[PDB]
């Protein structure tokens, strides 16, 4: 579909002003004026052109080449002129470079009709077939058979002047035209204005060329935003733990293994973290919160019959999560499961080059439609038990938290092959040779607008002290947000999925903050939000952008929100009864709540707390219709609230994750006393 020659069509006579760069499958190198809808009519006159690629014969014959305009043409085969009308021997299974230049002054028609022909020795002449033509090796190295060599200093195939001045791509029939940006035309039409470095084959320093990206000659799994030359395409992987089971480790000394199941099974919630002011760290990490809610009230050790000399082990179901912009194919990264500050309990590895599927951007391994991975799998004799000694086990009970630290070892890359127009995993290309340079030459933005989860993107930006990086276009904060995260601006206001930019805060590392502060001073600007178009990003900046509605822990996970926000989010009550409340609660708000406390307040002001335990707050559930039910009966012994006097109040309180207590207090109290909570419903019995 893409094979044939690469063509440069210029409006000037001397190969200086390229109007169109496109490829054509066969020897027909024509561009009809019907396809130049995005080129001003005056510039549809092509006075010169250059095509470039390779030819391969499927039968070794003596061939004679000819074109539509031999008098305006010079053609070379392997640096030999064949046109400037003679015969030349060509061998099967060998590849020959092709260059063709064309010049015609003051053409009277628009576009170009031009065909490349050959005649074999049986004297039969034909437009050269698609199967005989290949594109140039627009790579940074030649291949064994295909060498590399109209100003194109980085050899990506986009001429220096287009990369510097701005270009657009438009999708024709089965072809993609690359052309200069022209304001009056392409702005109305809504097209994206691309700039890129004429000296960087990949301007973002990733494994896909600026040309591959914008022409779709690229791994279909690469994220849509990373098809922009200025957005880095690379994987970003963390592990998601979905649940966990603890149990006592069998023991040499106890011979009987007939005893009752004494395990502890808990759901877990895992979030990708970022530890700050933004951090400079490129590590992958996630934190796991083990559910503290009711599963009587024995200690873990009492539950499992653990004496102080015993050991326990854990199993858990997990998935890998790719929140980056490029797929992984044949190596999942290695992960440490860590307890407390640095007690590694386990090393989690998958089997290299034996992945059951690719791990795509915005996706999981295994895919959610398949079973998760179990840390100790059932069909796996050699799975290492994840063990804790007794003190570690109590530490786990008290913290109810684990950390998964995942390396950046991501294996080989699927790259485009100009010889055959296919994408295939390349054993000679590895993510480890790419990531260091991506990290060195881009600004990193971490943004949580999607669903309060941290999503990192990197955007090519100038390093003022490194002359090469100096050849990239200026990247503004505003542009960065648009191309990397899909911010748009329907009314002079930058927003993300309907939320104004000013609904998110800005945080930077120390160096970046001082940089941005200087820039605002030079702009005589006091408010970043009103000059995003003028704030310039540099390589190595780190920027953290977070929904302002919420409170964040040191990991930058949303763990709360203002009383006013939580209250307002609950104001709309569909239905209330002695059995519970039915509300409409923003999915973002539900994420920051550990549960609810229900209480009846009598006439003298005394309070009966219905679900009065730190592990009994889990009384909300999300209904099949998106509405939340708060269930009064759950810890009321399956009975609706009994209100002995209509003037009594039913109060319901929301408890946020940062106010959630996860253990009995020091003195031993398992009640809700002292828990910081937020009143969100209060009505008399007669109002219910
Ligand atoms: Ca180039
Ligand atoms: Ca380039």
Q: What is the CATH number of the domain that holds 278?
A: 2.60.120.240
In CATH, what number is assigned to the domain containing residue 594? 2.60.40.810
Same domain, 197 and 255: no
- How many beta carbons lie within 10 A of that of residue 676, not counting itself? 12
Same domain, 429 and 444: no
CB 360, CB 226: distance < 8 Å: no
Q: Which two tokens stand for residue 288?
A: 């796991």
3-state secondary structure 133-181: EECCCCCCCCCCCCCCCCCCCCCCCCCHHHHHHCEEEEECCCCEEEEEC
CB 457, CB 233: distance < 8 Å: no
Binding site feature residues for Ca(2+): 152, 154, 156, 158, 163, 197, 200, 210
419 backbone φψ class: left, alpha, beta (φ>0; ψ -120 to 50)? alpha
The ligand placed nearest to the CA atom of residue 152 is 1
The ligand placed nearest to the CA atom of residue 194 is 2
Residue 317: phi, psi to the nearest 5? Answer: -100, 140
Round to whole Å and give the CA distance between 351 and 379. Answer: 14
With residue 399 as reference, give the H or E element that holds it.
Answer: helix 390-399
In CATH, what number is assigned to the domain containing residue 19? 3.90.182.10
E strands, 585-636, in order? 593-601, 607-609, 620-622, 628-631
Same domain, 205 and 179: yes
Same domain, 635 and 619: yes
DSSP state of 528: G
Same domain, 155 and 195: yes
How close is the Cα of 138 to the center of ligand 1, in Å?
9
Round to whole Å and give the CA distance between 52 and 79. Answer: 12
Q: From residue 668, give the alpha-carbon distance in Å to each of 14, 299, 618, 663.
A: 87, 12, 21, 9
How close is the Cα of 230 to the center of ligand 2, in Å?
10
Tokens 């061939």 sit at which residue? 63
Q: How many whole angstroms from its chain centre is CA 660?
A: 31
How close is the Cα of 473 to the center of ligand 2, in Å?
11
Same domain, 180 and 156: yes
Domain boundary among 439, 461, 479: 439
**CA torsion sign, 174 to 179 to 184 to 190?**
positive
Q: Which two tokens stand for residue 99?
A: 């260059």
Domain boundary among 399, 420, 439: 439
Same domain, 427 and 321: yes
- CB contact set of 564 (below 8 Å; sequence gap of 6+): none
Structural domain including 127 reads: 1-233
Domain boundary among 502, 533, 558: 558
Round to whole Å and give the CA distance between 209 and 345. Answer: 42
Q: What is the tally of structural domains in the chain?
A: 4
Task: Provide, for the chain, the percentages of residues in helix, strand and coil under a 3-state DSSP scheme, each rounded to the nearest 5.
Answer: 15, 35, 50
Same domain, 184 and 270: no
The ligand placed nearest to the CA atom of residue 160 is 1
Same domain, 264 and 378: yes
CB 201, CB 210: distance < 8 Å: yes
How close is the Cα of 223 to the center of ligand 2, in Å?
19
With residue 440 as reference, give the H or E element that holds it.
Answer: helix 435-441
**CA torsion sign, 173 to 177 to 182 to 183?**
positive
Round to whole Å and give the CA distance between 287 and 270. Answer: 5
Round to whole Å and give the CA distance between 293 and 595. Answer: 10
Round to whole Å and give the CA distance between 153 and 171. Answer: 26
The ligand placed nearest to the CA atom of residue 157 is 1
Q: How many whole angstroms from its chain centre is CA 617?
A: 35
How close is the Cα of 183 to the center of ligand 1, in Å?
22
Round to whole Å and give the CA distance between 312 and 423. Answer: 48
Round to whole Å and give the CA distance between 37 and 213. Answer: 23
DSSP state of 679: E
Round to whole Å and give the CA distance between 279 and 554. Answer: 11
Same domain, 600 and 548: no
Round to whole Å and give the CA distance between 338 and 354. Answer: 26
3-state secondary structure 530-594: HCHHHCECCCCCEEEEEECCEEECCCCCEEEECHHHHHHHCCCEEEEECCEEEECCCHHHHHCEE
Residue 565: phi, psi to the nearest 5? Answer: -65, -50
DSSP class per residue in 2-65: --SEEEEEESSTTS-SEEEEEEESSSB--B-GGG-TTS-GGGGB--EEEEEEEEE-SS-EEEEE
Round to whole Å and give the CA distance between 328 and 221. Answer: 9
Method: X-ray
Determine whether 75 is exposed, middle or buried from the number of CB atoms within 10 Å of its CB (0-12, 13-18, 19+).
Answer: buried
How close is the Cα of 161 to the center of ligand 1, in Å?
9
CB 165, CB 180: distance < 8 Å: yes
Same domain, 185 and 276: no
- CB contact set of 519 (below 8 Å; sequence gap of 6+): 534, 535, 536
DSSP state of 111: B
Round to whole Å and give the CA distance between 453 and 592. Answer: 12
Round to whole Å and give the CA distance between 124 and 436. Answer: 55
Residues counted in the chain: 688
Angle at 544 between CA 282 and CA 515, to 5 degrees: 95
How close is the Cα of 154 to the center of ligand 2, in Å?
6
How close is the Cα of 17 to the center of ligand 1, in Å?
14
Ligand 2 (ion): residues with CB under 5 Å are: 154, 156, 196, 200, 210
Round to whole Å and give the CA distance between 340 and 285. Answer: 14
How close is the Cα of 153 to the center of ligand 2, in Å?
8
In CATH, what number is assigned to the domain containing residue 505? 3.10.20.110
Round to whole Å and give the CA distance between 564 and 603. Answer: 27
How close is the Cα of 164 to the center of ligand 1, in Å?
9
Closest of 233, 216, 168, 175 to residue 196, by C-alpha: 168
How close is the Cα of 167 to the center of ligand 2, in Å?
12
Binding site feature residues: 152, 154, 156, 158, 163, 197, 200, 210
CB 567, CB 679: distance < 8 Å: yes
Round to whole Å and give the CA distance between 286 and 406. Answer: 8
Round to whole Å and give the CA distance between 510 and 504. Answer: 20
CB 570, CB 562: distance < 8 Å: no
Same domain, 238 and 224: no
């Amino acid at each position: 579909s893409s094979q044939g020659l690469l063509g440069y069509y210029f409006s000037d006579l001397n190969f200086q002003a390229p109007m169109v760069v496109t490829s054509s499958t066969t020897g027909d190198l024509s561009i009809p004026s019907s396809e130049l809808e995005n080129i001003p009519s005056e510039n549809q006159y092509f006075q010169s052109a250059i095509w470039s690629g390779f030819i391969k014969v499927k039968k070794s014959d003596e061939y004679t080449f000819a074109t539509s305009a031999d008098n305006h043409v010079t053609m070379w085969v392997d640096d030999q002129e064949v046109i400037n009308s003679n015969k030349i021997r060509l061998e099967k299974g060998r590849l020959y470079q092709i260059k063709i230049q064309y010049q015609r002054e003051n053409p009277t028609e628009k576009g170009l009709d031009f065909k490349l022909y050959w005649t074999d020795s049986q004297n039969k002449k034909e437009v050269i077939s698609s199967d005989n033509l290949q594109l140039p090796e627009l790579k940074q190295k030649s291949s064994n058979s295909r060498k590399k060599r109209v100003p194109d200093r980085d050899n990506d195939g986009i001429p220096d002047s287009l990369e510097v001045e701005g270009y657009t791509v438009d999708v024709k029939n089965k072809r993609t035209f690359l052309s200069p940006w022209i304001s009056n035309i392409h702005e109305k039409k809504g097209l994206t204005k691309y700039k890129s470095s004429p000296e960087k084959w990949s301007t973002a320093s990733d494994p896909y060329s600026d040309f591959e990206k914008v022409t779709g000659r690229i791994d279909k799994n690469v994220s849509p935003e990373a098809r922009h030359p200025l957005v880095a395409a690379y994987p970003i992987v963390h592990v998601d733990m979905e649940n966990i089971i603890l149990s006592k480790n069998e023991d040499q000394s106890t011979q009987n293994t007939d005893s009752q199941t004494r395990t502890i099974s808990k759901n877990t919630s895992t979030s990708r973290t970022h530890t700050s002011s933004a951090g400079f760290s490129n590590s992958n990490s996630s934190t796991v919160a083990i559910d503290h809610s009711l599963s009587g009230e024995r200690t873990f050790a009492e539950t499992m019959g653990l004496n102080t000399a015993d050991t326990a082990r854990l199993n858990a179901n997990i998935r890998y999560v790719n929140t980056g912009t490029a797929p992984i194919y044949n190596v999942l990264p290695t992960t440490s499961l860590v307890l407390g500050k640095n007690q590694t309990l386990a090393t989690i590895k998958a089997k290299e080059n034996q992945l059951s599927q690719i791990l795509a951007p915005n996706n999981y391994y295994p895919s959610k439609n398949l079973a998760p991975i179990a840390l100790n799998a059932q069909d796996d004799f050699s799975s290492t038990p994840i063990t804790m000694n007794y003190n570690q086990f109590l530490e786990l009970e008290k913290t109810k938290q684990l950390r998964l630290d995942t390396d950046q070892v991501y294996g080989n890359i699927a790259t485009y092959n100009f010889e055959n127009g296919r994408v295939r995993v390349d054993t000679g290309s590895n993510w480890s040779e790419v990531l260091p340079q991506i990290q060195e030459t881009t600004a990193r933005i971490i943004f949580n607008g999607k669903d309060l989860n941290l999503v990192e993107r990197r955007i090519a930006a100038v390093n003022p002290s490194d002359p090469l990086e100096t050849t990239k276009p200026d990247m503004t904060l505003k542009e960065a947000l648009k191309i990397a995260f899909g911010f748009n601006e329907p009314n002079g206001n930058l927003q993300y999925q309907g939320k104004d930019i000013t609904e998110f805060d800005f945080n930077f590392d120390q160096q970046t903050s001082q940089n941005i502060k200087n820039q605002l001073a030079e702009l005589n600007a006091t408010n970043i939000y009103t000059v995003l178009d003028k704030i310039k990003l540099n390589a190595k900046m780190n920027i953290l952008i977070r929904d302002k509605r919420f409170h964040y822990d040191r990991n930058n996970i949303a763990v709360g929100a203002d009383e006013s926000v939580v209250k307002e989010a609950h104001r709309e009550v569909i239905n209330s009864s002695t059995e519970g409340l039915l509300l409409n609660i923003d999915k973002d708000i539900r994420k920051i709540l550990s549960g609810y406390i229900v209480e009846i307040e009598d006439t003298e002001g005394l309070k009966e707390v219905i679900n009065d335990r730190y592990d009994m707050l889990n009384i909300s559930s999300l209904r099949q219709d998106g509405k939340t039910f708060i269930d009064f009966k759950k810890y009321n012994d399956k009975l609706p609230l009994y209100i002995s006097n209509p003037n009594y109040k039913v109060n319901v309180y929301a408890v946020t994750k940062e106010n959630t207590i996860i253990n009995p207090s020091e003195n031993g109290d398992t009640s809700t006393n002292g828990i910081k909570k937020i009143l969100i419903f209060s009505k008399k019995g007669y109002e219910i």
